Coordinates of C-alpha atoms in Angstrom, one line a residue:
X71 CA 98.2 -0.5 -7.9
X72 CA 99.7 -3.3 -10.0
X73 CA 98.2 -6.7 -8.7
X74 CA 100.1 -8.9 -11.1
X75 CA 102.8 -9.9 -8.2
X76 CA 100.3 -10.5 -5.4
X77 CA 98.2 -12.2 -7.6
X78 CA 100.8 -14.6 -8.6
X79 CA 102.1 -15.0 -5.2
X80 CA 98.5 -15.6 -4.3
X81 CA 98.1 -18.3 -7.0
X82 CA 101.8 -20.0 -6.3
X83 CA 101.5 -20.3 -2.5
X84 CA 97.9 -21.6 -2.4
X85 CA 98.7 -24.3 -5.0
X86 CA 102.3 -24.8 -5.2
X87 CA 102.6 -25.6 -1.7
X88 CA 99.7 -28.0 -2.1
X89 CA 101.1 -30.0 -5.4
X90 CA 104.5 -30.2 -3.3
X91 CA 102.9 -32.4 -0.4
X92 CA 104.9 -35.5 -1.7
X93 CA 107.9 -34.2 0.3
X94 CA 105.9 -32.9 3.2
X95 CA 104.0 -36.8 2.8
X96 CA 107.4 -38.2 3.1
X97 CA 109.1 -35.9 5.5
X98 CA 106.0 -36.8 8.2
X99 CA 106.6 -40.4 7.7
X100 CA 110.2 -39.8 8.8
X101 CA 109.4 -37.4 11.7
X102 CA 106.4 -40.1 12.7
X103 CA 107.6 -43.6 12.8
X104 CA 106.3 -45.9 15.2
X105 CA 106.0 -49.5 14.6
X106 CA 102.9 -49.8 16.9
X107 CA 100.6 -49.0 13.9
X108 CA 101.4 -50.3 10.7
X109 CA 98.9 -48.4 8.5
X110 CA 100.7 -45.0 9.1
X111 CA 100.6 -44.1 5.3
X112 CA 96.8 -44.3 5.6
X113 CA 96.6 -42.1 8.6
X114 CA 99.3 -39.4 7.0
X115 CA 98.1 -39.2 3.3
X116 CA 94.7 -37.9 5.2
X117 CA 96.5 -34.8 6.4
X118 CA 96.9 -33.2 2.9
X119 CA 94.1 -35.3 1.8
X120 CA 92.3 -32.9 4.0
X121 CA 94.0 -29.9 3.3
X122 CA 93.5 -30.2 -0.6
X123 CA 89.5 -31.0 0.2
X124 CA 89.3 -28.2 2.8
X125 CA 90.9 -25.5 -0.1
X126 CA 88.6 -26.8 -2.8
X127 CA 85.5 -27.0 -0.9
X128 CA 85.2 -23.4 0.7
X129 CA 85.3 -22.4 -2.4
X130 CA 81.7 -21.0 -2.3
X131 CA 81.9 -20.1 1.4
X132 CA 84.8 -17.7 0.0
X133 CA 82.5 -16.5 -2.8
X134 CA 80.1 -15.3 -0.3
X135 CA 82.0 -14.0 2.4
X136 CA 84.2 -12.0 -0.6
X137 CA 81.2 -10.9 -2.6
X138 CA 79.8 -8.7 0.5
X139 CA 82.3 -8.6 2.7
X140 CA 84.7 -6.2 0.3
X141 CA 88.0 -8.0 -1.7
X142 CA 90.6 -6.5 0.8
X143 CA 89.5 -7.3 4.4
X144 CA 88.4 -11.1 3.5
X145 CA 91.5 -11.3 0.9
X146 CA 93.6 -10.1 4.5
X147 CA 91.7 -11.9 7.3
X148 CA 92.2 -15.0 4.9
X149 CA 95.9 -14.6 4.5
X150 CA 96.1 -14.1 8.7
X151 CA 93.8 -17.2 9.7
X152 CA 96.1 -19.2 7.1
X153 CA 99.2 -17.7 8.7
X154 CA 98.4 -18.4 12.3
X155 CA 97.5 -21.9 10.7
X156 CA 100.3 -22.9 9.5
X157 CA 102.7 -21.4 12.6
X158 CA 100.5 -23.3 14.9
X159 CA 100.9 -26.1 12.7
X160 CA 104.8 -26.3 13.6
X161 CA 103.7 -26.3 17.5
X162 CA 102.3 -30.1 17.0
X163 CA 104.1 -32.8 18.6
X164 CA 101.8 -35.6 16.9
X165 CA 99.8 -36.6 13.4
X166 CA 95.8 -36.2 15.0
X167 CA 96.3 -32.3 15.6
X168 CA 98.0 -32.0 12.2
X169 CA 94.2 -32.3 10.5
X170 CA 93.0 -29.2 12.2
X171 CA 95.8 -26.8 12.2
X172 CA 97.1 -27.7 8.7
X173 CA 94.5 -29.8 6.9
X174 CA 91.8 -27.2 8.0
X175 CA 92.8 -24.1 9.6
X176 CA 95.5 -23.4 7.2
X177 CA 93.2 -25.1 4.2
X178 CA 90.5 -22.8 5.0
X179 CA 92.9 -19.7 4.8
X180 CA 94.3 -20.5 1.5
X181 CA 90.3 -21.0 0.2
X182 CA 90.0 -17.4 2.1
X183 CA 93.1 -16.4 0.4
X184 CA 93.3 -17.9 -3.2
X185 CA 89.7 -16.2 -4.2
X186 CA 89.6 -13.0 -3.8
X187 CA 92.5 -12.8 -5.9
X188 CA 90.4 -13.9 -8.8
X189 CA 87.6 -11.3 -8.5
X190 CA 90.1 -8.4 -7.7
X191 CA 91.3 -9.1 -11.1
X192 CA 87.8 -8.0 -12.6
X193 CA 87.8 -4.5 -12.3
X194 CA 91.5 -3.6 -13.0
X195 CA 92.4 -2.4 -16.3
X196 CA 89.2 -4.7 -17.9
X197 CA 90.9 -4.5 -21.0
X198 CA 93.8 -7.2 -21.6
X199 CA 93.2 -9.9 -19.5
X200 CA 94.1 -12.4 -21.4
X201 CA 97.7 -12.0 -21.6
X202 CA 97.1 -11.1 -17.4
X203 CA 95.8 -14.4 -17.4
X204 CA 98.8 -15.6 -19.2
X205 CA 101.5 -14.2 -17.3
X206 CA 99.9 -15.0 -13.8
X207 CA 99.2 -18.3 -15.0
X208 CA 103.2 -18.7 -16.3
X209 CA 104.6 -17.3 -12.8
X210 CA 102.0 -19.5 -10.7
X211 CA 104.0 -22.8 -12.8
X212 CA 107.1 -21.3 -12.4
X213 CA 106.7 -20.6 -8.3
X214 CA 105.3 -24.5 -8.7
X215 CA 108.7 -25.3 -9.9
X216 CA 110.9 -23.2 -8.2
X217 CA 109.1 -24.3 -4.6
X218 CA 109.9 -28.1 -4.3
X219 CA 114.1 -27.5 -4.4
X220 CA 113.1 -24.8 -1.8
X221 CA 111.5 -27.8 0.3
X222 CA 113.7 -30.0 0.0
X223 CA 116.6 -27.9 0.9
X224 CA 114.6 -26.6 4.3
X225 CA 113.7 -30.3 5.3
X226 CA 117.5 -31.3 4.9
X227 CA 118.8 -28.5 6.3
X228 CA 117.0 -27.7 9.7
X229 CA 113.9 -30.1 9.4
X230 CA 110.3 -30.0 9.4
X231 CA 109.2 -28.1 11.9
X232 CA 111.2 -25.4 10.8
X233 CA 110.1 -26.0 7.2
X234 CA 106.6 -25.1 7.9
X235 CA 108.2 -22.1 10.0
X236 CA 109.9 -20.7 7.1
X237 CA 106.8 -21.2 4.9
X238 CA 104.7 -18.7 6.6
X239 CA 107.1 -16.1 5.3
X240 CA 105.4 -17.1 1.7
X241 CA 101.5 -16.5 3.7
X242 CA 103.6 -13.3 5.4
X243 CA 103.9 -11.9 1.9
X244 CA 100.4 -12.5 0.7
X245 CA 99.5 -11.2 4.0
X246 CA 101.3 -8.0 3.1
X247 CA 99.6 -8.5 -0.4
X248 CA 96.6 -7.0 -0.7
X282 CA 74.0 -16.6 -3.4
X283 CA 74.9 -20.2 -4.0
X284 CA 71.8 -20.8 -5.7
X285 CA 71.1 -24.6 -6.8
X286 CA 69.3 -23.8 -10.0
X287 CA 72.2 -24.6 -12.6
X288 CA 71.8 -28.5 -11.9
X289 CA 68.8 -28.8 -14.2
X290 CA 70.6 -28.4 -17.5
X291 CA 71.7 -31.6 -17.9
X292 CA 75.0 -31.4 -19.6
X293 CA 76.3 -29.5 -16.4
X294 CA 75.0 -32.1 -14.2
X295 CA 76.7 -35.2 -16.1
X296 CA 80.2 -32.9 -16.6
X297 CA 80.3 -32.0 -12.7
X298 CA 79.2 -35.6 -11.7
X299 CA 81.9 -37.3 -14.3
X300 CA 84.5 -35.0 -13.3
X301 CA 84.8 -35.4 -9.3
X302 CA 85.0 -39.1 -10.5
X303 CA 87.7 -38.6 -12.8
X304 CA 89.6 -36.9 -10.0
X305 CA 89.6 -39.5 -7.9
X306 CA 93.1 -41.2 -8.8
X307 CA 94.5 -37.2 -9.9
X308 CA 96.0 -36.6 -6.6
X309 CA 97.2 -39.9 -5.7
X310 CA 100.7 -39.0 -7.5
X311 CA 101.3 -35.7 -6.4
X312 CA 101.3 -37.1 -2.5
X313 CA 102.6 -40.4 -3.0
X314 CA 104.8 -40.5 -5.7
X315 CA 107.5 -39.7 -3.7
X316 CA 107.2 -42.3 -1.4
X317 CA 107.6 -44.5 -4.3
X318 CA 110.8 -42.8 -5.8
X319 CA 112.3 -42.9 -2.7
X320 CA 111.5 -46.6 -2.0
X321 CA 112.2 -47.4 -5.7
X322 CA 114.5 -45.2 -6.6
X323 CA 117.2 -44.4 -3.4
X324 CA 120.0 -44.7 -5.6
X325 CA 118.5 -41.8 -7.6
X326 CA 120.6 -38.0 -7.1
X327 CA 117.7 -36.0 -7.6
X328 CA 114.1 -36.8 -6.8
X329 CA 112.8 -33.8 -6.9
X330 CA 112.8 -33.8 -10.7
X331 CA 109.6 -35.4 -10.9
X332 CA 108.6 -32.0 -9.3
X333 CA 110.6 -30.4 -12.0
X334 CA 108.9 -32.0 -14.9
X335 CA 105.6 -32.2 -14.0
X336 CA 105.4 -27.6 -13.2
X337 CA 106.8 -27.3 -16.1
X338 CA 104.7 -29.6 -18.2
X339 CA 102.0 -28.1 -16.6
X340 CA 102.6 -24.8 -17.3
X341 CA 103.3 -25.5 -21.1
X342 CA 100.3 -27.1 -20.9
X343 CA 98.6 -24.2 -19.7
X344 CA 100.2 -21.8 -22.2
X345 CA 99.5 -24.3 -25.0
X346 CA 95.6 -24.7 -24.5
X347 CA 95.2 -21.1 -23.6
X348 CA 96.9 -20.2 -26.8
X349 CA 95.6 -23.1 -29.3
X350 CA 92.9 -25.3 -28.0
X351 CA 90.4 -22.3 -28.8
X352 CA 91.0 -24.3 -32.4
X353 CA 88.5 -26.1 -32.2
X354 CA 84.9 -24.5 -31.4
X355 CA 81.6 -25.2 -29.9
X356 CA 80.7 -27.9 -26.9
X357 CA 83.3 -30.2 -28.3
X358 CA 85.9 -28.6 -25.7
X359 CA 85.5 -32.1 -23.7
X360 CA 87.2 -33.6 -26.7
X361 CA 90.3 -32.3 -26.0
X362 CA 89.3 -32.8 -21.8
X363 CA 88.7 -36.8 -22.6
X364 CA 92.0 -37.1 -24.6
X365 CA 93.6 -35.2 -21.5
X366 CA 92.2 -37.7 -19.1
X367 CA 92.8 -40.6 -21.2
X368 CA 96.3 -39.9 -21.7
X369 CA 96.8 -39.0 -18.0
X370 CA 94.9 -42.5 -17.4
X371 CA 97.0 -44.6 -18.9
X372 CA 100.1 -42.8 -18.0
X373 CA 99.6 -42.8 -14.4
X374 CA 99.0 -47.0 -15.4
X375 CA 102.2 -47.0 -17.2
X376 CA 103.8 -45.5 -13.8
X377 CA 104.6 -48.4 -11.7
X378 CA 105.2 -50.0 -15.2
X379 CA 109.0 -48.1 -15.2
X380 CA 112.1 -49.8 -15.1
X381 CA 114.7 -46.4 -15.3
X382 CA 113.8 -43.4 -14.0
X383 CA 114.1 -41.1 -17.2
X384 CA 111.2 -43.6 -18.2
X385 CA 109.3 -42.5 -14.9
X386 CA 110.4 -38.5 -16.0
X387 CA 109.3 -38.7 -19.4
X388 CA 105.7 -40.1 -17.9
X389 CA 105.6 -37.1 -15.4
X390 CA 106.4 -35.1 -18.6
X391 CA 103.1 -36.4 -20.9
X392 CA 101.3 -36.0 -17.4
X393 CA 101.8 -32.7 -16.4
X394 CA 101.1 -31.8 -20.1
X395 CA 97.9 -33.1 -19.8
X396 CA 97.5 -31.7 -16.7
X397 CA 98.2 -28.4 -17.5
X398 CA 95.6 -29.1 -20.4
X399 CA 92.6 -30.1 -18.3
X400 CA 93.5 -27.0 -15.8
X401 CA 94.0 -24.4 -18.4
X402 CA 90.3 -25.7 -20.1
X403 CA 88.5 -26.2 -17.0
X404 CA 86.7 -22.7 -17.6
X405 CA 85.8 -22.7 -21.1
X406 CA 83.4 -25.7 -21.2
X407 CA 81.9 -24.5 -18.1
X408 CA 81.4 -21.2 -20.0
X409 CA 80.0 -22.9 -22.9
X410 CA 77.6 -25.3 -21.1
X411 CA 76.0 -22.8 -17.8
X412 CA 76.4 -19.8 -20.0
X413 CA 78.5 -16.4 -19.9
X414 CA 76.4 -15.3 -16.0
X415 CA 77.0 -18.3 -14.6
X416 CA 80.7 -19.2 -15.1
X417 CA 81.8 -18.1 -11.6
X418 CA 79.2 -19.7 -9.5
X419 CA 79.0 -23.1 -11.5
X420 CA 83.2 -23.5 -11.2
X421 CA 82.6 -22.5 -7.5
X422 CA 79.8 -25.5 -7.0
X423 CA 82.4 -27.5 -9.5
X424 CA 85.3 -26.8 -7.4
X425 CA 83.1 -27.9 -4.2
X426 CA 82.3 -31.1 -5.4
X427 CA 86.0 -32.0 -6.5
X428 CA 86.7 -31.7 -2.8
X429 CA 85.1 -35.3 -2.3
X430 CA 88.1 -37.0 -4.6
X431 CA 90.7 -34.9 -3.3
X432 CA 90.2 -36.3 0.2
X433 CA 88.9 -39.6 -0.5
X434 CA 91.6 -41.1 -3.3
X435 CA 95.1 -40.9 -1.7
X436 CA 93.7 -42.2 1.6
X437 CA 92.3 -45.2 -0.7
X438 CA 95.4 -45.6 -2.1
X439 CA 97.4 -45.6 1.4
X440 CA 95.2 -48.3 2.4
X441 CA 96.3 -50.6 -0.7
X442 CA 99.8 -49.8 -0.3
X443 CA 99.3 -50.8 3.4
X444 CA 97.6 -54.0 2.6
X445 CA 99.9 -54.6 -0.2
X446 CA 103.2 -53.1 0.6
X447 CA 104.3 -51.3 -2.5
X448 CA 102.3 -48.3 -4.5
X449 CA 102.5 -50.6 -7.8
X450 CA 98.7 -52.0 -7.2
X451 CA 97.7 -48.6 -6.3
X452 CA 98.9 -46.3 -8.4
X453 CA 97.9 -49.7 -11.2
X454 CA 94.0 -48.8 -9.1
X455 CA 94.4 -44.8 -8.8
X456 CA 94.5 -45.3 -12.6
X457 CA 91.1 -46.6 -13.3
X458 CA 88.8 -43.7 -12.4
X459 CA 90.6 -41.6 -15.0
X460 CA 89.0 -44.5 -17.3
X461 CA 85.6 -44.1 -16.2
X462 CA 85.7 -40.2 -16.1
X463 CA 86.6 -40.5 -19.9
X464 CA 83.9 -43.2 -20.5
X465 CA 81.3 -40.5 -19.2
X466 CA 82.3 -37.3 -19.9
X467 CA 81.9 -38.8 -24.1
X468 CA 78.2 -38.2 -24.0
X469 CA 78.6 -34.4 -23.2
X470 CA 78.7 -33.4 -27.1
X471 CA 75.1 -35.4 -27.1
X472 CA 73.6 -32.2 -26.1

């Protein structure tokens, strides 16, 4: 009757497997050379590309199926399609098959999944939720922290094959656990946040499945890669903590101030990235990033519930989350292609950068009206 565990194993597998795809990026580039293609990084980065594009765009298919087909059985046939996903996805002997039966078989379970966990939470002890909010949110960051050493230790140890075998155990547990209408566009501050945010979003997950590539072809002498991993859960989670606690300071609209200065720091850190010479330079910039990051998660709701109004929140982040699937999908594929044409990630983690620049350039004429 207490939901608090599923719903932060819910939360940690759906997401903290998909902000660890750096070492499942690199471990596939390992398990799939061939010299016979030399754009493999653009080919590879389009298998989480996909899966991260897949999760955020059924997120209003989910709604519906969820809102009449009862929290339970689409919470559990979510969790099984996922499941049988991702074990079919260790029965692939090439990089094609891996869109399907990871980047949208197993995608499309963990959109079927992740949801229902939020609306189950609506009708359970409707009292304190905030500090439910808080405490799933703060074991969500810490499963995203604990779950890269996990990875790492599983690919080293008996490979990657294996590695997504043993993950299913994580999709066993939550297995065990437990009208899109169009009219909010014509209220224009909506429309100019949820077109200035999928563009700010572009160069967001560029780091998170290619960064380490870089540290490992910048930084081999490096003990402990994983760190970045480290630094940027829990930045993100003192992030979330933070602005969940604080950045109800200031009031009105003028939430997007603190969501500019979020994406303007994250901007020019993620510039500043190929910019390192020592590595605790490189940690201390996942450290301000994952701050931010945790910021601009934690305060994605309010200015959505302060713009579309108090009946719309669910259905406007549902259309918001469809439309960030575009950026998800498109960016890191971009920047594969300029490290292919290039040969290092400096120009494209120095281009990844830039949208940041322009979401911040647009999202300042929100306060307007």
């Amino acid at each position: 009757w207490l939901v608090m565990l599923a719903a932060m194993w819910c939360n940690g597998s759906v997401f903290g497997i998909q902000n660890a795809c750096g070492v499942l990026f690199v471990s596939m580039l390992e398990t799939f050379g061939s010299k016979d293609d030399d754009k493999m990084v653009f080919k590879t980065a389009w298998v989480g590309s996909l899966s991260m594009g897949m999760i955020f765009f059924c997120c209003p298919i989910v709604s519906v199926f969820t809102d009449l087909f009862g929290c339970r059985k689409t919470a559990v046939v979510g969790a099984a399609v996922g499941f049988v996903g991702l074990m079919s996805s260790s029965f692939v002997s090439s990089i094609e098959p891996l869109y399907l039966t990871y980047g949208i078989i197993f995608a499309c379970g963990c959109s079927f999944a992740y949801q229902p966990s939020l609306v189950i939470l609506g009708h359970y002890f409707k009292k304190r939720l905030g500090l439910v909010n808080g405490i799933v949110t703060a074991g969500s960051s810490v499963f995203t922290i604990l779950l890269p050493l996990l990875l790492r230790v599983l690919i080293d140890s008996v490979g990657l094959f294996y590695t997504l075998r043993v993950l299913c155990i994580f999709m066993f547990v939550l297995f065990l656990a437990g009208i899109f209408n169009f009219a909010i566009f014509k209220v224009t501050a909506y429309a100019v946040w949820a077109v200035g945010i999928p563009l700010a979003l572009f160069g967001y997950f560029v780091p998170y499945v290619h960064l380490m590539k870089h540290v490992n072809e910048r930084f081999q002498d490096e003990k402990n890669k994983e760190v970045v991993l480290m630094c940027i859960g829990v930045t993100s989670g003192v992030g979330r903590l933070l602005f969940g606690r604080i950045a109800d300071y200031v009031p009105g609209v003028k939430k997007v101030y603190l969501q500019v200065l979020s994406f303007f720091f994250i901007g020019l850190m993620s510039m500043m990235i190929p910019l390192c010479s020592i590595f605790g330079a490189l940690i201390a910039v996942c450290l301000i990033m994952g701050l931010f990051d945790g910021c601009f998660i934690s305060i994605m709701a309010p200015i959505a519930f302060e713009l579309v109004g108090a009946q719309d929140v669910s259905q406007a982040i549902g259309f918001l989350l469809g439309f960030m699937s575009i950026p998800m999908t498109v960016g890191p594929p971009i920047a594969g292609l300029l490290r292919d044409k290039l040969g290092s990630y400096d120009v494209a983690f120095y281009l990844a950068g830039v949208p940041p620049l322009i979401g911040g350039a647009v999202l300042c004429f929100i306060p307007w009206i």
